[PDB]
Amino acid sequence: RLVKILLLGAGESGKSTFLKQMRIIHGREFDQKALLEFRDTIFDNILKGSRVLVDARDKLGIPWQHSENEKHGMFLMAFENKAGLPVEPATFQLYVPALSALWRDSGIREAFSRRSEFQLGESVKYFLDNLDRIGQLNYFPSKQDILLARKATKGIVEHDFVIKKIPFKMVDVGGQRSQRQKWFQCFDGITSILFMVSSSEYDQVLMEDRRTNRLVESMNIFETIVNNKLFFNVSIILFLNKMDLLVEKVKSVSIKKHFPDFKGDPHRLEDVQRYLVQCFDRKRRNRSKPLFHHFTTAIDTENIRFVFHAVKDTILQE
Ligand SMILES: Nc1nc2c(ncn2[C@@H]2O[C@H](COP(=O)(O)OP(=O)(O)O)[C@@H](O)[C@H]2O)c(=O)[nH]1
Ligand code: ALF
Ligand SMILES: [Mg+2]
Protein backbone atom coordinates (compact mmCIF):
# COMPACT_ATOMS: atom_id res chain seq x y z
CA ARG A 1 0.00 0.00 0.00
CA LEU A 2 2.00 2.93 -1.41
CA VAL A 3 0.79 6.30 -0.10
CA LYS A 4 0.37 8.86 -2.89
CA ILE A 5 0.57 12.51 -1.74
CA LEU A 6 -0.25 15.52 -3.92
CA LEU A 7 1.40 18.94 -3.43
CA LEU A 8 -0.99 21.77 -4.38
CA GLY A 9 -1.22 25.55 -4.01
CA ALA A 10 -0.85 28.90 -5.80
CA GLY A 11 2.28 30.03 -7.68
CA GLU A 12 5.37 30.73 -5.54
CA SER A 13 4.04 29.01 -2.39
CA GLY A 14 6.93 26.56 -1.77
CA LYS A 15 5.68 23.30 -3.31
CA SER A 16 9.00 22.50 -5.00
CA THR A 17 10.91 23.81 -1.98
CA PHE A 18 9.10 21.28 0.21
CA LEU A 19 9.79 18.47 -2.29
CA LYS A 20 13.48 19.36 -2.05
CA GLN A 21 13.38 19.06 1.74
CA MET A 22 12.03 15.54 1.22
CA ARG A 23 14.98 14.51 -0.93
CA ILE A 24 17.51 16.05 1.45
CA ILE A 25 15.88 14.21 4.34
CA HIS A 26 14.57 10.92 2.87
CA GLY A 27 15.89 10.68 -0.74
CA ARG A 28 19.36 10.21 -2.25
CA GLU A 29 21.55 13.33 -2.47
CA PHE A 30 22.13 15.26 -5.68
CA ASP A 31 24.75 14.13 -8.20
CA GLN A 32 26.83 16.82 -9.94
CA LYS A 33 24.34 16.93 -12.85
CA ALA A 34 21.57 18.28 -10.59
CA LEU A 35 24.00 20.32 -8.47
CA LEU A 36 25.24 22.28 -11.49
CA GLU A 37 21.65 22.80 -12.59
CA PHE A 38 20.89 24.35 -9.20
CA ARG A 39 23.86 26.68 -9.65
CA ASP A 40 22.71 27.88 -13.08
CA THR A 41 19.41 28.63 -11.40
CA ILE A 42 21.12 30.43 -8.51
CA PHE A 43 23.26 32.51 -10.83
CA ASP A 44 20.21 33.26 -12.97
CA ASN A 45 18.12 34.04 -9.86
CA ILE A 46 20.73 36.64 -8.89
CA LEU A 47 21.04 38.24 -12.34
CA LYS A 48 17.31 38.54 -13.12
CA GLY A 49 16.38 39.83 -9.65
CA SER A 50 18.98 42.60 -9.82
CA ARG A 51 17.87 43.61 -13.30
CA VAL A 52 14.45 44.08 -11.73
CA LEU A 53 15.81 45.95 -8.67
CA VAL A 54 17.86 48.25 -10.91
CA ASP A 55 14.75 48.95 -12.99
CA ALA A 56 12.60 49.20 -9.87
CA ARG A 57 14.31 52.22 -8.27
CA ASP A 58 14.20 53.84 -11.72
CA LYS A 59 10.49 53.22 -12.41
CA LEU A 60 9.76 54.34 -8.81
CA GLY A 61 12.02 57.39 -9.14
CA ILE A 62 14.16 56.45 -6.10
CA PRO A 63 17.55 58.23 -6.27
CA TRP A 64 20.94 56.53 -6.07
CA GLN A 65 22.99 56.67 -2.88
CA HIS A 66 26.17 57.01 -4.93
CA SER A 67 25.21 58.13 -8.44
CA GLU A 68 28.31 56.38 -9.86
CA ASN A 69 26.28 53.17 -9.52
CA GLU A 70 24.33 54.17 -12.66
CA LYS A 71 27.08 52.52 -14.66
CA HIS A 72 26.85 49.32 -12.63
CA GLY A 73 23.10 49.38 -13.23
CA MET A 74 23.79 49.64 -16.96
CA PHE A 75 25.78 46.41 -16.84
CA LEU A 76 22.70 44.37 -15.86
CA MET A 77 19.96 46.04 -17.93
CA ALA A 78 20.64 44.09 -21.12
CA PHE A 79 20.92 40.73 -19.33
CA GLU A 80 18.34 38.19 -20.49
CA ASN A 81 17.68 34.45 -20.22
CA LYS A 82 13.94 34.37 -20.99
CA ALA A 83 13.18 30.77 -22.07
CA GLY A 84 16.96 30.19 -21.90
CA LEU A 85 19.07 28.07 -19.56
CA PRO A 86 22.79 27.49 -18.85
CA VAL A 87 24.53 30.45 -17.16
CA GLU A 88 28.19 29.66 -16.62
CA PRO A 89 30.57 30.72 -13.80
CA ALA A 90 32.64 32.89 -16.17
CA THR A 91 29.47 34.77 -17.22
CA PHE A 92 28.48 35.45 -13.62
CA GLN A 93 31.85 36.52 -12.26
CA LEU A 94 31.81 39.46 -14.68
CA TYR A 95 28.69 40.68 -12.87
CA VAL A 96 29.99 40.10 -9.30
CA PRO A 97 31.67 43.52 -8.99
CA ALA A 98 28.50 45.20 -10.27
CA LEU A 99 26.16 43.19 -8.03
CA SER A 100 28.09 43.88 -4.82
CA ALA A 101 28.32 47.61 -5.55
CA LEU A 102 24.61 47.95 -6.30
CA TRP A 103 23.55 45.90 -3.28
CA ARG A 104 25.53 48.26 -1.05
CA ASP A 105 23.60 51.21 -2.52
CA SER A 106 20.89 52.28 -0.06
CA GLY A 107 18.78 53.35 -3.06
CA ILE A 108 18.54 49.69 -4.14
CA ARG A 109 17.96 48.15 -0.70
CA GLU A 110 15.13 50.72 -0.37
CA ALA A 111 13.78 49.48 -3.71
CA PHE A 112 13.83 45.95 -2.29
CA SER A 113 11.83 47.28 0.70
CA ARG A 114 9.11 48.44 -1.72
CA ARG A 115 9.24 44.98 -3.34
CA SER A 116 5.47 44.52 -3.01
CA GLU A 117 4.94 47.41 -5.46
CA PHE A 118 5.99 45.02 -8.25
CA GLN A 119 7.07 41.38 -8.89
CA LEU A 120 10.31 40.02 -7.40
CA GLY A 121 11.00 36.70 -5.66
CA GLU A 122 12.53 38.04 -2.42
CA SER A 123 14.92 35.06 -2.49
CA VAL A 124 17.15 37.69 -4.22
CA LYS A 125 18.11 39.28 -0.89
CA TYR A 126 19.62 36.12 0.63
CA PHE A 127 22.00 35.65 -2.30
CA LEU A 128 23.13 39.27 -2.64
CA ASP A 129 23.51 39.19 1.17
CA ASN A 130 26.13 36.45 0.83
CA LEU A 131 27.32 37.14 -2.72
CA ASP A 132 30.83 36.96 -1.25
CA ARG A 133 30.99 33.16 -1.34
CA ILE A 134 28.57 32.73 -4.24
CA GLY A 135 30.70 35.18 -6.25
CA GLN A 136 33.88 33.29 -5.30
CA LEU A 137 35.41 31.66 -8.36
CA ASN A 138 35.16 27.93 -7.46
CA TYR A 139 31.70 28.11 -5.88
CA PHE A 140 29.40 25.11 -5.47
CA PRO A 141 25.91 25.62 -3.97
CA SER A 142 25.07 24.71 -0.38
CA LYS A 143 21.89 22.97 0.69
CA GLN A 144 20.59 26.32 1.86
CA ASP A 145 21.38 28.06 -1.42
CA ILE A 146 19.59 25.23 -3.25
CA LEU A 147 16.43 25.37 -1.12
CA LEU A 148 16.36 29.14 -1.62
CA ALA A 149 16.78 28.85 -5.41
CA ARG A 150 13.72 29.27 -7.60
CA LYS A 151 12.59 27.60 -10.79
CA ALA A 152 8.98 27.85 -11.98
CA THR A 153 7.45 24.38 -12.29
CA LYS A 154 5.96 24.14 -15.78
CA GLY A 155 5.19 20.40 -15.53
CA ILE A 156 4.55 17.45 -13.20
CA VAL A 157 7.14 15.44 -11.20
CA GLU A 158 6.57 12.25 -9.22
CA HIS A 159 9.15 11.70 -6.47
CA ASP A 160 9.47 8.33 -4.75
CA PHE A 161 10.68 7.66 -1.20
CA VAL A 162 10.46 4.91 1.41
CA ILE A 163 10.07 6.49 4.86
CA LYS A 164 10.10 4.08 7.83
CA LYS A 165 9.59 1.13 5.45
CA ILE A 166 6.46 2.73 3.91
CA PRO A 167 6.64 3.54 0.18
CA PHE A 168 5.61 7.19 -0.36
CA LYS A 169 5.07 8.87 -3.71
CA MET A 170 4.78 12.66 -3.91
CA VAL A 171 3.75 14.72 -6.91
CA ASP A 172 4.78 18.32 -7.41
CA VAL A 173 2.85 20.39 -9.99
CA GLY A 174 2.72 24.10 -10.90
CA GLY A 175 0.54 26.67 -9.14
CA GLN A 176 0.03 29.41 -11.76
CA ARG A 177 -3.35 29.84 -13.47
CA SER A 178 -1.89 28.31 -16.64
CA GLN A 179 -0.57 25.23 -14.83
CA ARG A 180 -3.67 24.47 -12.73
CA GLN A 181 -5.16 23.11 -15.97
CA LYS A 182 -2.92 20.03 -15.49
CA TRP A 183 -3.96 19.21 -11.90
CA PHE A 184 -6.78 16.80 -12.88
CA GLN A 185 -4.22 14.28 -14.18
CA CYS A 186 -2.76 13.92 -10.67
CA PHE A 187 -6.11 13.60 -8.88
CA ASP A 188 -6.01 9.87 -9.64
CA GLY A 189 -5.65 7.58 -6.59
CA ILE A 190 -4.22 10.19 -4.20
CA THR A 191 -4.22 9.45 -0.46
CA SER A 192 -3.59 13.01 0.66
CA ILE A 193 -3.23 16.61 -0.46
CA LEU A 194 -0.60 18.94 1.02
CA PHE A 195 -2.07 22.38 0.28
CA MET A 196 0.43 25.21 0.73
CA VAL A 197 0.00 28.94 1.28
CA SER A 198 2.57 31.69 1.04
CA SER A 199 1.19 33.39 4.15
CA SER A 200 3.48 36.43 3.83
CA GLU A 201 1.68 37.58 0.65
CA TYR A 202 -1.29 39.57 1.98
CA ASP A 203 0.21 42.81 0.62
CA GLN A 204 1.28 41.30 -2.73
CA VAL A 205 -0.65 41.10 -6.04
CA LEU A 206 -0.65 37.94 -8.15
CA MET A 207 2.00 37.81 -10.89
CA GLU A 208 -0.10 36.49 -13.79
CA ASP A 209 -2.41 39.49 -13.37
CA ARG A 210 -1.66 43.00 -12.06
CA ARG A 211 -4.74 43.22 -9.80
CA THR A 212 -5.82 40.04 -7.92
CA ASN A 213 -4.53 39.60 -4.34
CA ARG A 214 -2.25 36.59 -3.78
CA LEU A 215 -3.73 35.36 -0.50
CA VAL A 216 -7.33 35.76 -1.66
CA GLU A 217 -6.45 33.50 -4.62
CA SER A 218 -4.99 30.93 -2.24
CA MET A 219 -8.22 30.99 -0.24
CA ASN A 220 -10.28 30.80 -3.46
CA ILE A 221 -8.36 27.72 -4.62
CA PHE A 222 -8.50 26.05 -1.22
CA GLU A 223 -12.28 26.45 -1.07
CA THR A 224 -12.70 24.56 -4.35
CA ILE A 225 -10.38 21.69 -3.44
CA VAL A 226 -11.37 21.19 0.19
CA ASN A 227 -15.13 20.90 -0.55
CA ASN A 228 -14.85 18.41 -3.40
CA LYS A 229 -16.66 15.03 -3.48
CA LEU A 230 -13.72 13.59 -5.38
CA PHE A 231 -11.59 14.28 -2.28
CA PHE A 232 -14.11 12.94 0.29
CA ASN A 233 -11.85 9.98 1.25
CA VAL A 234 -8.69 12.12 1.11
CA SER A 235 -6.67 13.73 3.90
CA ILE A 236 -6.25 17.48 3.31
CA ILE A 237 -3.54 19.27 5.31
CA LEU A 238 -2.80 22.99 5.12
CA PHE A 239 0.74 24.46 5.24
CA LEU A 240 0.87 28.14 6.15
CA ASN A 241 4.36 28.68 4.80
CA LYS A 242 6.95 31.49 4.74
CA MET A 243 6.34 31.94 8.48
CA ASP A 244 9.80 33.48 8.86
CA LEU A 245 9.04 36.07 6.16
CA LEU A 246 5.59 36.60 7.65
CA VAL A 247 7.19 37.59 10.96
CA GLU A 248 9.00 40.40 9.15
CA LYS A 249 6.00 41.84 7.25
CA VAL A 250 3.77 41.77 10.32
CA LYS A 251 6.18 44.25 11.98
CA SER A 252 6.17 46.88 9.19
CA VAL A 253 3.20 46.34 6.83
CA SER A 254 -0.34 45.82 8.19
CA ILE A 255 -2.90 43.35 6.87
CA LYS A 256 -5.66 45.75 8.07
CA LYS A 257 -5.18 47.74 4.86
CA HIS A 258 -5.78 44.66 2.70
CA PHE A 259 -8.26 42.69 4.83
CA PRO A 260 -10.48 45.29 6.53
CA ASP A 261 -12.69 42.65 8.19
CA PHE A 262 -9.60 41.64 10.21
CA LYS A 263 -10.36 42.44 13.85
CA GLY A 264 -7.30 42.10 16.05
CA ASP A 265 -3.87 43.61 16.61
CA PRO A 266 -2.36 43.98 13.10
CA HIS A 267 1.25 43.87 14.39
CA ARG A 268 1.02 40.74 16.54
CA LEU A 269 2.12 37.52 14.82
CA GLU A 270 -0.50 35.36 16.57
CA ASP A 271 -3.37 37.82 15.95
CA VAL A 272 -2.55 37.45 12.26
CA GLN A 273 -1.69 33.72 12.49
CA ARG A 274 -5.06 32.82 14.00
CA TYR A 275 -6.95 34.97 11.50
CA LEU A 276 -5.43 33.00 8.61
CA VAL A 277 -6.38 29.59 10.06
CA GLN A 278 -9.89 30.99 10.52
CA CYS A 279 -10.18 32.34 6.98
CA PHE A 280 -9.23 28.93 5.56
CA ASP A 281 -11.35 27.21 8.19
CA ARG A 282 -14.27 29.39 6.96
CA LYS A 283 -14.07 28.29 3.31
CA ARG A 284 -15.04 24.74 4.41
CA ARG A 285 -18.62 23.49 4.32
CA ASN A 286 -17.85 20.51 6.56
CA ARG A 287 -16.42 22.31 9.58
CA SER A 288 -17.10 19.24 11.77
CA LYS A 289 -13.81 17.36 11.47
CA PRO A 290 -10.91 19.66 12.48
CA LEU A 291 -8.54 21.52 10.14
CA PHE A 292 -5.17 19.76 10.12
CA HIS A 293 -2.64 22.60 9.74
CA HIS A 294 0.94 23.70 10.42
CA PHE A 295 2.95 26.93 10.26
CA THR A 296 6.00 25.95 8.19
CA THR A 297 9.15 27.50 6.84
CA ALA A 298 10.05 25.25 3.89
CA ILE A 299 13.60 26.62 3.60
CA ASP A 300 14.37 25.49 7.20
CA THR A 301 15.11 21.75 7.04
CA GLU A 302 14.54 20.87 10.72
CA ASN A 303 11.16 22.57 10.84
CA ILE A 304 10.14 20.35 7.92
CA ARG A 305 11.54 17.08 9.34
CA PHE A 306 9.56 17.82 12.50
CA VAL A 307 6.42 18.92 10.64
CA PHE A 308 6.47 15.95 8.26
CA HIS A 309 6.71 13.32 11.02
CA ALA A 310 3.42 14.75 12.33
CA VAL A 311 1.89 14.83 8.85
CA LYS A 312 2.98 11.19 8.35
CA ASP A 313 0.91 10.26 11.42
CA THR A 314 -2.21 12.27 10.53
CA ILE A 315 -2.30 10.63 7.11
CA LEU A 316 -1.47 7.03 8.08
CA GLN A 317 -3.91 7.02 11.03
CA GLU A 318 -6.82 8.06 8.74
N1 LIG B 1 11.76 32.57 3.38
C2 LIG B 1 11.11 31.50 2.88
N3 LIG B 1 11.16 31.31 1.54
C4 LIG B 1 10.55 30.24 0.97
C5 LIG B 1 9.81 29.31 1.83
N6 LIG B 1 9.30 28.37 1.02
C7 LIG B 1 9.68 28.67 -0.25
N8 LIG B 1 10.43 29.78 -0.26
C9 LIG B 1 11.00 30.44 -1.45
O10 LIG B 1 9.94 30.72 -2.36
C11 LIG B 1 10.36 30.53 -3.71
C12 LIG B 1 9.32 29.67 -4.43
O13 LIG B 1 9.45 28.32 -4.02
P14 LIG B 1 8.78 27.16 -4.92
O15 LIG B 1 8.82 25.85 -4.17
O16 LIG B 1 9.40 27.05 -6.30
O17 LIG B 1 7.29 27.71 -5.10
P18 LIG B 1 6.21 26.85 -5.90
O19 LIG B 1 5.84 27.59 -7.16
O20 LIG B 1 5.00 26.71 -5.01
O21 LIG B 1 6.79 25.51 -6.25
C22 LIG B 1 11.76 29.93 -3.66
O23 LIG B 1 12.71 30.91 -4.09
C24 LIG B 1 11.99 29.59 -2.21
O25 LIG B 1 13.31 29.95 -1.81
C26 LIG B 1 9.80 29.60 3.29
O27 LIG B 1 9.20 28.85 4.09
N28 LIG B 1 10.45 30.69 3.73
F1 ALF C 1 3.73 26.95 -8.17
AL2 ALF C 1 5.30 27.01 -9.01
F3 ALF C 1 6.85 27.03 -9.91
F4 ALF C 1 5.08 28.76 -9.26
F5 ALF C 1 5.52 25.26 -8.76
MG1 LIG D 1 7.08 24.52 -8.29
Report which of 288, 165, 303 is spatially closest to residue 226, judged by C-alpha positions: 288
Among 101, 121, 152, which residue terminates a domain?
Answer: 152
Task: Answer yes or no: is the C-beta of 123 below 6 A from any ligand 1 atom.
Answer: yes
Residue nearest to atom 4 of ligand 2 (CA): 11
Longest dimension (CA), the chain: 64
Of the candidates 145, 172, 201, 217, the residue annotated as catalytic is 172
Ligand 1 centre to CA of 17 (Å) is 5
Task: Answer yes or no: is the C-beta of 40 below 6 A from any ligand 1 atom.
Answer: no
Give bridge partners of residue 167 from the DSSP assignment: 162
Closest ligand 2 atom to residue 150 Cα is: 3
Q: What is the CATH number of the domain that holds 316?
A: 3.40.50.300
- 59: which residues sit within 8 A by CB, 6+ positions away? 118
**What is the resolution in angstroms?**
2.9
Please measure the distance between the N-terminal and C-terminal CA atoms of the chain and give it in whole angstroms: 14
Task: Answer yes or no: is the C-beta of 117 below 6 A from any ligand 1 atom.
Answer: no
Same-domain status, 178 and 275:
yes
Closest ligand 1 atom to residue 245 Cα is: 1
Print the domain residue range for 272: 1-30+153-318
Q: What is the CATH number of the domain that holds 130?
A: 1.10.400.10
Same-domain status, 219 and 138:
no
What does the chain come to in residues? 318
Same-domain status, 261 and 178:
yes
Ligand 1 centre to CA of 13 (Å) is 6
Same-domain status, 169 and 303:
yes
Ligand 2 centre to CA of 57 (Å) is 27
Q: How far is CA 232 from the centre of its chain?
A: 28
Same-domain status, 267 and 211:
yes
In the chain, how many domains are there? 2
* 3-state SS string for the chain: CCEEEEEEECCCCCHHHHHHHHHHHHCCCCCHHHHHHHHHHHHHHHHHHHHHHHHHHHHCCCCCCCHHHHHHHHHHHCCCCCCCCCCCHHHHHHHHHHHHHHHHCHHHHHHHHCHHHCCCCCHHHHHHHCHHHHCCCCCCCCHHHHHHCCCCCCCEEEEEEEECCEEEEEEEECCCHHHHCCHHHCCCCCCEEEEEEECCCCCCECCCCCCCEHHHHHHHHHHHHHCCHHHCCCEEEEEEECHHHHHHHHHHCCCCCCCCCCCCCCCCHHHHHHHHHHHHHHCCCCCCCCCCEEECCCCCHHHHHHHHHHHHHHHHHC
Among 126, 152, 178, which residue terminates a domain?
Answer: 152
Order of strands, edge to edge, in the sheet holding 166-173? 156-163, 166-173, 3-9, 192-198, 235-241, 293-295
Among 136, 152, 168, which residue terminates a domain?
Answer: 152
